[PDB]
Amino acid sequence: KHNMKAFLDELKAENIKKFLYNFTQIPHLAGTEQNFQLAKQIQSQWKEFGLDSVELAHYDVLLSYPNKTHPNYISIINEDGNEIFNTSLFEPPPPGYENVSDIVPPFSAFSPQGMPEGDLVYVNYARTEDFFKLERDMKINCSGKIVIARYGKVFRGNKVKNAQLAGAKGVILYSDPADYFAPGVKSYPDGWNLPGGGVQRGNILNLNGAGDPLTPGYPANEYAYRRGIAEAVGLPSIPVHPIGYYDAQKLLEKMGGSAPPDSSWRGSLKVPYNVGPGFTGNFSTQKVKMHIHSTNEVTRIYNVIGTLRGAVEPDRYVILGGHRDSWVFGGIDPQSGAAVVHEIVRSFGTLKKEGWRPRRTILFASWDAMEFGLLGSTEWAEENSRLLQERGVAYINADSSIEGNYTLRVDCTPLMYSLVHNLTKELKSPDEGFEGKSLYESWTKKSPSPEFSGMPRISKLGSGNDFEVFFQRLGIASGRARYTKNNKFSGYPLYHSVYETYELVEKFYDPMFKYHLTVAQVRGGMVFELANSIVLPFDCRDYAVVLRKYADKIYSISMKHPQEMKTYSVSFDSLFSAVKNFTEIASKFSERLQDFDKSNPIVLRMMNDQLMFLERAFIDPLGLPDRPFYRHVIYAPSSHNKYAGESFPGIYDALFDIESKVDPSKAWGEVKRQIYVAAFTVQAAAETLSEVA
């Protein structure tokens, strides 16, 4: 028969391996001819696999590229202005790729041009708390200095934003072996570690969900009216460039001024990690000079959108999407995910060719220009927002399938917790020592929930991936899953480097492609259940549990300030009342969902609509403060780290560093305003689960 087991059994590790090889032989940088060619290939193959339609959706968006005849680099210059040390112009290419054309050299996408020259300040990971330590405790002023920061811990766009606000005139990002070289493992090509010449590419935008910098709110189509560069969203104001640790060692070794304040500031290089400013006495007249000549350029991008029409509810969409554009070869990022999507499409198409169709419509997406700011998914969702908000059931992301080989990682809305627990109990574990055991069992053992015994850890969705528009802007239930390591925001060692190749994966991560297969089963199984279950597989009671946990958490933060809560009458009573009400109403809804007349399709679809619109109810059309495209009131990307999720973000940001605000009455008034918005939104969402009339 045509059930989930038939779907799952059709998935093959050997097919995923073949597809991954096929997708990783040449670079597929967004906006380049080779990435358009791959888009056309995937369009062709998805049609052959059996989808009902497969179209390209193109947009013309702002991208950024180095100047091929005017290379980016950093120098140490002496008092005469001679450049006595230069950083590399390219990463040494890996074995057998030393003749591959069009490898983009390391750069920070969207850096402005400039040639700033000055003294170096070392800022650790350039986190908000690193800058607090420098300015408030150490009394070091970054104004007009070049800051050097190690990658890791937070999104690099937040590092650059923090450096700008500190007054820096340039930023140098580098990979420290403390964060990108695991002890006892060899550098690529002999292991999975970053060599000293390796460099992490990546954009440094602060888009806050806007998509293309020139067209916030609206798709970058053929008649779009663009902002000028000066009014564009999210662009950095100071030049930025990434380097590897051989080059970093040359810039850091001469540093003087203050000692590092403690050991959490010291990486693994044989240097003092002095904060500066500038170099020790003998070299005190030498300076650092950046030379950045990259250009921003409106460029065409192509999403591939495949449709498998539903038999019963064709106007309900379950979406499986992941990106296709890569920095270089994309051996892990994104092609390990794209190969998994390809095999899922192939498996669904096999069932379709035998006469089966899912209950609801499945959409498959191959997004472009993700690496330049989630641009392809966001423009597409801007174009199709009315269809998505009235018809969108769920979005399952499909970027990198592996970032390690230890255990499963899932991040998703609470609405999908039960779905994920149930699916993983039915899947086989691929782990050594768990032969014959469920994936649920291995996952729960290796990654225990911090809160509940016998349950696995499932994280909040953060951001930095293509689910952002669907979840935080539009309010469509979203999830992601991949295999992971036993630091989660720093990336694996070869992240966004030229060394991320097919060989990396086949030799060191997943030789038998069994972890890829497991991830294909999780992502595909989730899509299958969402698109085929008669009642949508969402449990509203799980949202009630987490809402109470988040309310306790935010209350606890506020309670660090008892005097102010007294003075300004700051009560969380309304939020706890709303959460209590949500808990009560969700319980009664669950009872009706279990008990309703199962022969009545209108009550069923009424109740499926209540399930589908529950995530939608947490959207506030006015957005969060100064972040209009982050509209979900329960979850937003952290204002300090785009990759991390923050709960009750409006209240969290109102409380953050409140003791430093010059007008406490105004600051605590804003805390109270955010408590009111959150209590109202939770009650309003609860009331969508009440009897409808």
Ligand X SMILES: CC(C)C[C@H](OC(=O)N[C@@H](CCC(=O)O)C(=O)O)C(=O)O
Ligand Y SMILES: *[C@@H]1O[C@H](CO)[C@@H](O[C@@H]2O[C@H](CO)[C@@H](O[C@@H]3O[C@H](CO[C@H]4O[C@H](CO)[C@@H](O)[C@H](O)[C@@H]4O)[C@@H](O)[C@H](O[C@H]4O[C@H](CO)[C@@H](O)[C@H](O)[C@@H]4O)[C@@H]3O)[C@H](O)[C@H]2NC(C)=O)[C@H](O)[C@H]1NC(C)=O
Ligand Z SMILES: *[C@@H]1O[C@H](CO)[C@@H](O[C@@H]2O[C@H](CO)[C@@H](O)[C@H](O)[C@H]2NC(C)=O)[C@H](O)[C@H]1NC(C)=O
Ligand U SMILES: *[C@@H]1O[C@H](CO)[C@@H](O[C@@H]2O[C@H](CO)[C@@H](O[C@@H]3O[C@H](CO)[C@@H](O)[C@H](O)[C@@H]3O)[C@H](O)[C@H]2NC(C)=O)[C@H](O)[C@H]1NC(C)=O
Q: Which residues bind ligand Z (CB under 6 A)?
A: 22, 25, 41, 44-45, 83-86
Binding mask 427-466 for ligand X (x = CB under 6 A): -------------------------------------xx-
Binding mask 174-203 for ligand NAG (x = CB under 6 A): ------------------x-----------
How many other C-beta atoms lie within 10 A of the C-beta of residue 640? 18
Reading the block at residue 239, the tokens are 């030049």
Are the CB atoms for 415 and 615 separated by under 8 Å?
A: yes
Cα 422 to Cα 295, 439, 476, 674, distances in angstroms: 49, 10, 21, 36
621 interacts with a second copy by CB under 8 A:
yes
Compute the distance between CA of residue 4 and CA of residue 578 in angstroms, rounded to an integer. Answer: 38
Could you say which residues in the range 351-390 bind a second copy, by CB under 8 A? 361, 383-387, 390
In whole angstroms, the minimum distance from the beta carbon of 202 to Zn ion comes to 7
56 interacts with ligand Y by CB under 6 A:
yes
DSSP state of 563: H
In whole angstroms, the minimum distance from the beta carbon of 387 to ligand Y comes to 14
Segment holding 643, helix H or strand E: strand 641-647
E-strand ranges in 19-153 read 53-65, 73-77, 83-86, 108-109, 117-118, 120-122, 146-150
Could you say which residues in the range 294-323 bind ligand NAG, by CB under 6 A? 295
Compute the distance between CA of residue 603 and CA of residue 525 in angstroms, rounded to an integer. Answer: 26
CA dihedral 643, 639, 206, 676 (to 10 degrees): 120
Reading the block at residue 381, the tokens are 């969702």
Partner interacting with residue 574 (select from ligand U, ligand Y, Ca ion, none; CB below 5-8 Å by kind): ligand Y
E-strand ranges in 110-192 read 117-118, 120-122, 146-150, 170-174
Q: Which of 26/517 has CB closer to ligand Z?
A: 26
| Closest among 656, 648, 639, 640 to 675, alpha carbons compared | 648
Compute the distance between CA of residue 441 and CA of residue 517 in angstroms, rounded to an integer. Answer: 17
688 interacts with ligand Y by CB under 6 A:
no
Could you say which residues in the range 371-410 bind Zn ion, by CB under 5 A? 399
Cα 369 to Cα 111, 383, 565, distances in angstroms: 17, 16, 46
537 interacts with ligand U by CB under 6 A:
yes
Binding mask 408-437 for ligand U (x = CB under 6 A): ----------xx--x---------------
Task: Convert 498-538 into a string of H (helix), E (strand) and C (coil).
Answer: CCCCHHHHHHHHCCCCHHHHHHHHHHHHHHHHHHHCCCCCC
533 interacts with a second copy by CB under 8 A:
no
688 interacts with a second copy by CB under 8 A:
yes
33 interacts with ligand U by CB under 6 A:
no
Could you say which residues in the range 573-592 bind ligand Y, by CB under 6 A? 574, 577-578, 581
Contact stretch for Zn ion (CB under 5 A) within 153-161, 331-339, 539-547, 612-620: 331-339
Could you say which residues in the range 307-326 bind a second copy, by CB under 8 A? 307, 309-310, 312-315, 317
- Indicate which single residue of 222, 262, 435, 663 sits in contact with ligand Y (rule: CB under 6 A): 222
Compute the distance between CA of residue 46 and CA of residue 245 in angstroms, rounded to an integer. Answer: 42
615 interacts with ligand U by CB under 6 A:
no
Binding residues for ligand NAG, total number by CB under 6 A = 12
Q: Which residues bind ligand Y (CB under 6 A)?
A: 55-56, 58, 222, 574, 577-578, 581, 679, 683
Q: Which residues bind ligand X (CB under 6 A)?
A: 155, 202-203, 371, 373-374, 399-400, 464-465, 489, 491, 495, 642-643
Q: Which residues bind Zn ion (CB under 5 A)?
A: 333-334, 399
